Design a protein around this ligand. Structure first.
Ligand code: FAD
Ligand code: FAD
Ligand code: FAD
Ligand code: SF4
Ligand code: SF4
Ligand code: SF4
Ligand code: SF4
Ligand code: SF4
Ligand code: SF4
Ligand code: SF4
Ligand code: SF4
Ligand code: SF4
Ligand code: SF4
Ligand code: SF4
Ligand code: SF4
Ligand code: FES
Lengths: 296, 662, 137, 79, 411, 84
């Protein structure tokens, strides 16, 4: 049973707690142990906080990293934006000496040092790796087939891009996340421009809601045209955009889709037999009941 | 010994960094120095006259010139030393310009003067110990080899043969012609590309002075400028030419190219000439215009069914049990003309080359548009066989790219061939529109700008924007090309029926292996390197090897042919003379110091060293022709039994001692 | 009163070309190193280096072609092995082995030749005068 | 020489994959046993395949047909 | 009997078996080879005078090898260089040579450098626990043992102590105690670790012979097919008796060999740190080497020095008449020999000026060895500079993790 | 190659535009410096009849024999050979 510190940023615990609950339960069912991070905070959200000040972005991400450093554990994440912040600041401060120095003399005011001893993983990346739980182990753990459901994957942008800074391979047409959805028994479908941004990154969600919603609506149109019955995602930002933004699209525009948006951990819980009440699917703006009728 | 020291000013390039007067007075007070003197331009005719007059007047044993680099002016001053009654090799330079002045210009003058005095002292110390050498002259075999049967190889072979030298033309493939045989029409003259080549192919095939050896490779090369012992692998063609059939005893003949064999062969495989678009049997020719019309057998795919031999009948040209024969050929010079291949553009995933059906590259487009290709010359969509009406051309596909996937250089001809293809589609399909997504149209050659003007006049759309990514419509299989029109200032989404990628070119497959066999180095770009990038673009640093064609860097057929004839001329220079002088830097074994340990023998890359019998004692023997003067053996030998002719241990140690003299 | 005495032994085909290119490009560096110019670095015998160090070279530099880029196919592998062994001998006779180094400079690296010159000068200046000159007496 | 994979998560230790394998049954149940190596052995309650390098299986399907709650997947394609 | 067998061997002839130090098997094998005409001569050591004088001898009459029987512990000489100089390198005649570990290593060094013909030479190797200089042994016996040295009959290093047999009885003193007091084995013998010459054709010793044969049997290890043939021929013609060795004997032979390795390591340590570090080692080396009077005995005695004319004789390296000679003289030997020094000690012990040539050279050799991984004198592996390899050179440059040869090479 | 050659140049010196160039793209070599050796080779070659400051008045003939008339413009100064 591999053990990881569970970073747990802002949106999953405070808006979609079923995501974190299913994360812990399903990760324990497969051979992974997710340990609470002691006093972790907002990973300085890369858009809304990196746009303001890169130095304080570095300092806060480094503080989050040195918490798990003192814990002597590897970070595990469930958010693409949190992955950007944590993993990328870890990578930058493992190689840039003057930035290490600057962050260290900022952190020395709170009796705290960064040395760069741990690694950062996304939970879906762990589920895909073969040393850690693999696709076959996920298939083994699945107990409810979830058959006869068309499911559209949204990769997001901060997990895989830029490919010159990550290690997940092709960004033009990846299929790894489609294999994790196929392990659950749901057939993943392909839609036009599947690698498009959801529109919520960089603080655009806050600065220009209509612009962000138009970017989201382009995706929703493509997904409905494909014929999806739900949208899996690996990011609470993207889930919030696809969930709230459907309501804001219904009100600001006149478009109705009613497409449930679920984190992959929530689908994994559904596959492994967790209850909809135990997943808190009532906390989503868009009702999941048609999808539950199909897969149950 | 009596040494003369002549210090050049180089026209203030040296006098503006040191005190030439002080250097000269120090040279006068140096030991062994008979005369020290200075001049503004020692490389000029008054400078050589000054050297010669000094030699005659002062009875000089050796000459030291404190001037520019030896790599720049050894031949000049060696010839000046010869003219004057000395050996050319009683001369030594002291580089006090490119290693003293130009690097110690600013704010440091007496330091540069002291450095110059030190360099002059070391040069005088070496020259007081130099002694006479005579360059070795070696005979040159009157044959030549041309590796590559493309336009550059064929032109070089024809040029050498018509100059009268017997020539070998080695081609790995069963036919000569190269890429130009695959081209359909040629920019900017729009001539039938294959047709222009056909007379020259016939000339090569008929020339009595050319030994055309197709379907053959170069296993190994040893030797030097004089004699290159080149071993060739005659791959098992499986079919006998009439000459070989008569030699083996079949009077009725060999292969006449009737085609019955391929009419009955049941195996069907892709044709590499047609870039895989077209079928060909196990026994086959690339196209109907191949020069040796001899019908290779593909032994990796033949099932030995024996139908081909029954079809061939009394001609008995097919020998299904043939094996790779090896031949050793002695040649005087060699010309390398290996050409190029298209860079693998499936690595650029944003342009769905392998993943979308209707995305092709420019050689596949050229085969599709040729009238002798898999189609009847009709461009049709690979996805469904329908005629396109909008065609996009992605220029710079994998080129001028610093991301590590593509090539950082320009492929030279891809702007021109994309213009040609746009013209061809707009004239062959009525109402079809060509869109060129370009980033610097490069029509630099003769009539190229006029060709560009004419294409725009016929109505190709030029969108200045590098393509960002390509999406495939799920149903119509049409391709959505996304970029920005940089001049218009807006993003664009052009939906085309067919997308053509003007991919970069790279050195052919196996070219690095062949150039390592011949001893040629590579450029920064990965192409074969030339002797001097400006004034010697054909010859290489290894003597007797010359470059021709795209193998030295991408070029159009005109530039390729000019380069090929230049290489043929350079390869003919030593063959016509019949003599060639080697540089007397060889290793010479001092036998009554050699102990016969044999340990130096394995330190020679060229196998110039061996153990032999002289006066009962087993001593080492140098093949002075094979030695190249590196000095590894002579730097090894513990007993000092190997002497390096112009860089002897006493000379080098005298230089060290003079440096530490104060 | 003291100026470092550094001696360089540079091959003709990459290190001499690189030094010439640096000069042509007008890259300045201090005037402390004087060069010998042999054909290959395979020519460099160990006794050359040891003779330099016993005459009193405060430093010795040997510059040649990159691995795989020797004009004579493999003459700098021999030089590299020889200089590794020379580094070992100087360490065990108690002379400071950082007085000696072997750099691989290509024909196009005039800037790198300038940087090598600067770094060799700096290192020898830090090290100080060689001890042989006073140990002889 | 195929590859068998046992889903440890639902293996009950029933040992009917060990008893039914005809390569395991070679040692004790053959006249003059040829090879005495064994694919499965139930260690700590789950079936462990000692045949790590996929040299002894013969794709018989006696073990896949034997496990009561299907848990053994047989791969007929090269690993 | 076959290339790896470990045997007990003694001579059938009772007189040969008495005069052997152990069972006379080296003298029975040499006699058999000579008289059955495997070999045309035999190069062994005989006493020329008192047992402190060891004289090499080429023997062609099979009647003279009984005079060669017995081991002289004061025989500090080296045989293979004499075969190259005065027997034409054994290029035309077969020889059978009795040799210690240093003499086997020297054979292999000279055969690497093509100076002898190991196809012709047969090497019967003896175990060696150390040799004493004859004059130092005399002073040892006069002072520490309190005996007149001319009284001694035999003398041997057995169980790590120096047993002497004189008229009156026998005595014994620990060799470690003697070596602390300033006597004992030679310095290079204290540092030596080539205790059982497994590179020879036969290895004979008194280690591992236990029980009823503790002083009348030789432990033989057959180390090659040539030695197997010699032994089988001798046993069949009946000049030598063979019984398979005792497993307990083999075990304690291994243990004594291993303990001798550890002792050699300890002496290597204490000597090499006794030389100093940094500029102190340069003043030690330079002040010692300033004594050299250029007798060239070190060059003429070294097995690795095979050059017609030494570079130390070339006027562009060494000034011909300047007697307080340069440090270049010894730098030229460190450069040429230190990569393959077999620690024979001849350079140290033949120096009129008492310069620690072997100590300096071995101190350099041990870590040229741990750098390049080349053990001198074991087999036909070419010297490190006579065989340079492309892949290995890449490997050592990459291991430094650096673009040059400057640092990150040593720990 | 061994053929005797005439080199006609209208100007008093050979070299052309490259003699006027200062440094050369893309290698940034001293243009005049690289040219200086080849000019010396041309001036010394025994098989080259270097005729500077000379023009071609008229040409008649064909592939076989071209009867080319040259105008040796009045240089005003004598080379050593012509002076002797
Ligand atoms: C799509 C496209 C269109 C083009 N259109 C034009 C155009 O319209 N006009 C124009 O002027 N140029 C055009 N070019 C460029 C033109 O093709 C080249 O200038 C020309 O072909 C160079 O010929 P080459 O002989 O140097 O090389 P190649 O034609 O490639 O010939 C090399 C030959 O050597 C052989 N060979 C390779 N390696 C070995 C080996 N180891 N041993 C033996 N033989 C070997 C190959 O099989 C081949 O036969 C075009 C290029 C492309 C890609
Ligand atoms: C200096 C020395 C130290 C030794 N130390 C040990 C030891 O610690 N442990 C051990 O087990 N064995 C040691 N031996 C070897 C020991 O003597 C063997 O047990 C013995 O050689 C067995 O042979 P033998 O009695 O059967 O034949 P022997 O009749 O003894 O034959 C001995 C042979 O050795 C030759 N010989 C004598 N002196 C020398 C010499 N100085 N150099 C070379 N050859 C010589 C003789 O000529 C003869 O051919 C040593 C030998 C020597 C010479
Ligand atoms: C500003 C500039 C910079 C350049 N820089 C570079 C550069 O960095 N690198 C590079 O590679 N190229 C460069 N070039 C291009 C380069 O100059 C040419 O490639 C090259 O000079 C061509 O030489 P040529 O012998 O053909 O012509 P020219 O050099 O012009 O030589 C022609 C010669 O013929 C003589 N002549 C003319 N008419 C007659 C006649 N009727 N009878 C007799 N003699 C006659 C002329 O006097 C002249 O000596 C540059 C060009 C320019 C204009
Ligand atoms: S010889 Fe060199 S330094 Fe002297 S003038 Fe000519 S180019 Fe200048
Ligand atoms: S049938 Fe025979 S002669 Fe005719 S093409 Fe085939 S091989 Fe040549
Ligand atoms: S043997 Fe059969 S498969 Fe081969 S070429 Fe002839 S007909 Fe085709
Ligand atoms: S020739 Fe034109 S299309 Fe080809 S790489 Fe250069 S700029 Fe791009
Ligand atoms: S020249 Fe030197 S290395 Fe070569 S065989 Fe003679 S002694 Fe040996
Ligand atoms: S110098 Fe020596 S090693 Fe180099 S090519 Fe000549 S003989 Fe061979
Ligand atoms: S398939 Fe057959 S041989 Fe293979 S493990 Fe199962 S029962 Fe055994
Ligand atoms: S038969 Fe099935 S449940 Fe029983 S041990 Fe084997 S794999 Fe497990
Ligand atoms: S050096 Fe070693 S083998 Fe030679 S006598 Fe001394 S201890 Fe014995
Ligand atoms: S033996 Fe001693 S004195 Fe004689 S040359 Fe060698 S070091 Fe000098
Ligand atoms: S240097 Fe001395 S100790 Fe080393 S092998 Fe030579 S003689 Fe023996
Ligand atoms: S020191 Fe060197 S040169 Fe002198 S004999 Fe020994 S190996 Fe030969
Ligand atoms: S040519 Fe420079 S190292 Fe060999």
């Amino acid at each position: 049973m591999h053990e990881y510190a569970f970073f747990l940023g802002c949106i999953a615990p405070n808006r979609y707690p079923g995501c974190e609950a299913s994360a812990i339960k399903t990760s324990e069912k497969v051979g992974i142990k997710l340990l609470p991070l002691k006093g972790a905070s907002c990973c300085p959200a890369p858009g809304a906080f990196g746009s303001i000040d890169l130095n304080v972005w570095y300092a806060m991400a480094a503080r989050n990293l040195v918490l798990a450093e003192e814990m002597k554990k590897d970070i595990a994440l469930i958010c693409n934006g949190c992955y950007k912040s944590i993993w990328e600041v870890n990578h930058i401060l493992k190689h840039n000496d003057e930035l290490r120095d600057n962050v260290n003399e900022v952190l020395a005011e709170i009796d705290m040092q960064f040395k760069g001893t741990i690694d950062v993983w996304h939970l879906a990346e762990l589920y895909y790796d073969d040393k850690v739980c693999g696709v076959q182990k996920i298939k083994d753990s699945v107990t409810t087939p979830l058959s006869g459901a068309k499911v559209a994957a949204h990769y997001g942008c901060h997990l895989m891009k830029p490919k010159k800074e990550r290690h997940f391979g092709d960004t033009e047409n990846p299929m790894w996340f489609e294999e994790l959805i196929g392990a659950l028994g749901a057939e993943p479908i392909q839609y036009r421009n599947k690698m498009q941004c959801c529109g919520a990154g960089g603080g655009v969600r806050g600065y220009d809601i209509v612009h962000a919603l138009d970017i989201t609506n382009e995706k929703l149109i493509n997904i409905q045209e494909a014929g999806a019955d739900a949208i899996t995602e690996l990011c609470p930002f993207c889930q919030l955009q696809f969930d709230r933004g459907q309501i804001e699209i219904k009100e600001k525009f006149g478009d109705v889709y009613n497409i449930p948006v679920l984190h992959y951990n929530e689908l994994l819980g559904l596959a492994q037999g967790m209850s909809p009440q135990d997943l808190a699917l009532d906390l989503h703006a868009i009702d999941c009941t048609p999808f539950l009728q199909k897969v149950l | 010994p009596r040494i003369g020291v002549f210090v050049c000013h180089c026209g203030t390039n040296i006098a503006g960094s040191m005190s030439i007067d002080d250097v000269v007075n120090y040279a006068k007070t140096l030991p062994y120095v008979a005369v020290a003197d200075q001049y503004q331009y020692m490389c000029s005719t008054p400078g050589q006259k000054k050297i010669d007059d000094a030699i005659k007047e002062y009875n000089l044993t050796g000459v030291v010139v404190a001037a520019c680099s030896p790599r720049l002016h050894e031949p000049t001053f060696r010839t000046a030393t010869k003219e004057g009654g000395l050996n050319p090799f009683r001369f030594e330079m002291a580089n006090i310009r490119e290693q003293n002045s130009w690097v110690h210009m600013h704010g440091m003058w007496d330091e540069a003067t002291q450095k110059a005095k030190d360099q002059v002292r070391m040069a005088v110390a070496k020259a007081a110990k130099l002694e006479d050498l005579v360059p070795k002259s070696v005979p040159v075999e009157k044959t030549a080899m041309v590796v590559g049967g493309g336009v550059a190889g064929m032109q070089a072979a024809l040029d050498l043969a018509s100059a009268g030298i017997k020539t070998y033309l080695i081609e790995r493939t069963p036919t000569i012609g190269g890429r130009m045989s695959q081209l359909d029409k040629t920019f900017p003259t729009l001539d039938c590309s294959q047709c222009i080549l056909t007379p020259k192919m016939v000339d090569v095939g008929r020339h009595p002075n050319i030994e055309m050896m197709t379907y053959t490779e170069v296993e190994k090369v040893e030797g030097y400028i004089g004699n290159f012992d080149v071993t060739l692998r005659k791959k098992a063609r499986g079919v006998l030419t009439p000459t070989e059939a008569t030699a083996k005893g079949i009077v009725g003949g060999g292969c006449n190219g009737c085609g019955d064999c391929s009419a009955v062969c049941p195996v069907i495989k892709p044709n590499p000439f047609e870039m895989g678009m077209a079928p060909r049997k196990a026994i086959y020719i690339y196209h109907a215009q191949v020069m040796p019309l001899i019908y290779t057998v593909d032994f990796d795919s033949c099932v030995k069914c024996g139908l081909c031999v029954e079809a061939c009948g009394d001609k008995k040209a097919i020998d299904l049990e043939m094996q790779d024969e090896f031949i050793t050929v002695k040649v005087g010079t060699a010309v390398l003309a290996t050409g190029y291949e298209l860079f693998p553009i499936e690595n650029k995933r944003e342009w769905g080359y392998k993943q979308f059906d209707n995305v092709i590259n420019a050689l596949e487009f050229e085969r599709l548009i040729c009238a002798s290709g898999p189609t009847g010359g009709h461009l049709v969509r690979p996805s469904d066989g329908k005629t396109p009406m909008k065609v996009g051309f992605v220029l710079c596909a994998g080129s001028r790219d610093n991301t590590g996937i593509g090539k950082p250089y320009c492929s030279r001809f891809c702007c021109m061939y994309s213009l040609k293809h746009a013209h061809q589609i707009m004239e062959k399909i009525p109402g079809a529109v060509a869109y060129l997504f370009y980033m610097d149209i490069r029509s630099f050659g003769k009539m190229y700008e006029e060709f560009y003007y004419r294409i725009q006049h016929e109505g190709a759309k030029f969108i200045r924007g590098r393509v960002a990514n390509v999406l495939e419509d799920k149903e119509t299989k049409n391709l959505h090309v996304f970029t920005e029109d940089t001049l218009l200032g807006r993003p664009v989404d052009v939906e085309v029926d067919l997308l053509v990628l003007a991919a970069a070119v790279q050195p052919n497959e196996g070219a690095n292996e062949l150039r390592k066999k011949f001893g040629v180095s590579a450029s920064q770009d990965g192409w074969m390197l030339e002797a001097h990038p400006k004034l010697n673009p054909c010859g290489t640093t290894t003597a007797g090897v010359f470059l021709a064609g795209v193998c030295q860097g991408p070029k159009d057929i005109p530039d390729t042919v000019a380069q090929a004839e230049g290489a043929a001329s350079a390869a003919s220079i030593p063959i016509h003379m019949g003599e060639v002088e080697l540089e007397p830097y060889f290793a010479m074994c001092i036998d009554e110091l050699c102990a016969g340990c044999g340990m130096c023998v394995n330190l020679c890359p060229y196998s110039a060293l061996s153990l032999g019998e002289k006066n009962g004692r087993t001593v080492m023997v140098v093949t002075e022709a094979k030695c190249k003067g590196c000095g590894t053996c002579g730097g090894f030998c513990p007993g000092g039994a190997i002497k390096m002719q112009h860089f002897t241990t006493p000379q080098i140690v005298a230089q060290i001692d003079a440096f530490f003299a104060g | 009163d003291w100026k470092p005495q550094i001696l360089a032994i540079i091959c003709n085909w990459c290190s001499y070309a690189g030094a010439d290119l640096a000069g042509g490009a007008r890259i300045q560096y201090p005037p402390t190193v004087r060069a010998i110019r042999v054909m290959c670095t395979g020519r460099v015998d160990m006794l050359f280096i040891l003779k330099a160090f016993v005459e009193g070279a405060d430093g010795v530099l040997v510059s040649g072609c990159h691995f795989g880029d020797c004009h004579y196919l493999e003459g700098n592998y021999k030089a590299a092995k020889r200089m590794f062994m020379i580094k070992n001998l100087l360490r065990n006779i108690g002379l400071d082995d950082r007085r000696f180094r072997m750099t691989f400079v290509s024909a196009s690296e005039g800037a790198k030749w300038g940087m090598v010159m600067e770094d060799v000068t700096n290192t020898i200046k830090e090290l100080g005068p060689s001890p042989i000159k006073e140990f002889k007496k | 020489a195929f590859a068998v994979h046992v889903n440890m998560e639902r293996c009950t230790g029933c040992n009917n994959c060990v008893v039914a394998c005809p390569v395991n049954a070679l040692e004790l149940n053959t006249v003059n046993p040829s090879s005495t190596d064994k694919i499965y052995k139930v260690i700590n309650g789950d079936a462990v395949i000692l045949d790590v390098k996929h040299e002894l299986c013969a794709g018989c399907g006696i073990c896949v047909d034997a496990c009561p709650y299907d848990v053994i997947q047989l791969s007929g394609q090269p690993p | 009997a076959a290339k790896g067998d470990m045997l007990y061997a003694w001579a059938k002839d009772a007189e040969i078996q008495k005069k052997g130090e152990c069972g006379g098997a080296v003298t029975a094998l040499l006699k058999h080879a000579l008289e059955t005409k495997m070999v045309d001569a035999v190069v062994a050591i005989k006493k020329g005078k008192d047992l402190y004088d060891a004289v090499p001898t080429v023997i062609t009459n099979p009647e003279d090898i009984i005079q060669t029987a017995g081991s002289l512990h004061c025989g500090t000489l080296l045989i293979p260089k004499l075969i190259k100089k005065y027997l034409n390198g054994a290029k035309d005649m077969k020889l059978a040579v009795t040799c210690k570990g240093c003499d086997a290593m020297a054979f292999y060094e000279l055969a690497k450098r093509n100076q002898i013909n190991l196809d012709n030479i047969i090497m019967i190797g003896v175990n060696c626990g150390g040799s004493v200089s004859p004059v130092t042994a005399r002073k040892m016996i006069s002072n520490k043992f309190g005996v007149d040295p001319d009284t001694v009959h035999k003398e041997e290093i057995d169980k790590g102590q120096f047993i002497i047999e004189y008229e009156g009885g026998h005595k014994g003193i620990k060799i470690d105690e003697l070596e602390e007091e300033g006597y004992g084995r030679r310095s290079n013998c204290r540092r030596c670790k080539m205790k059982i010459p497994r590179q020879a054709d036969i290895a004979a010793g008194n280690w591992g012979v236990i029980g009823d044969k503790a002083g009348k049997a030789t432990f033989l290890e057959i180390c090659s097919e040539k030695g197997a043939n010699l032994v089988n021929s001798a046993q069949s013609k009946g000049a030598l008796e063979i019984s398979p060795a005792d497993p307990k004997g083999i075990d304690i032979r291994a243990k004594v060999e291993k303990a001798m390795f550890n002792l050699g390591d300890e002496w290597r340590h204490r000597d090499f740190e006794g030389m100093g570090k940094g500029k102190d080692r340069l003043k030690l080396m330079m002040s010692e080497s300033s004594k050299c009077i250029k007798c060239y005995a070190c060059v003429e005695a070294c097995p690795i020095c095979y050059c017609i004319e030494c570079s130390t004789k070339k006027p562009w390296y060494i000034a011909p008449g300047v007697l307080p000679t340069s440090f270049m003289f010894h730098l030229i030997r460190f450069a040429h020999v230190s990569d393959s020094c077999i620690n024979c000690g001849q350079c140290e012990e033949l120096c009129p000026m008492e310069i620690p040539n072997a100590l300096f050279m071995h101190s350099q050799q041990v870590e040229i060895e741990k750098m390049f991984g080349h053990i001198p004198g074991q087999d036909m592996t070419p010297p490190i500079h006579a065989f340079v390899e492309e892949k290995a050179e890449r490997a050592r440059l990459d291991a430094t993790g650096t673009d040059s040869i400057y640092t990150n090479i040593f720990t």
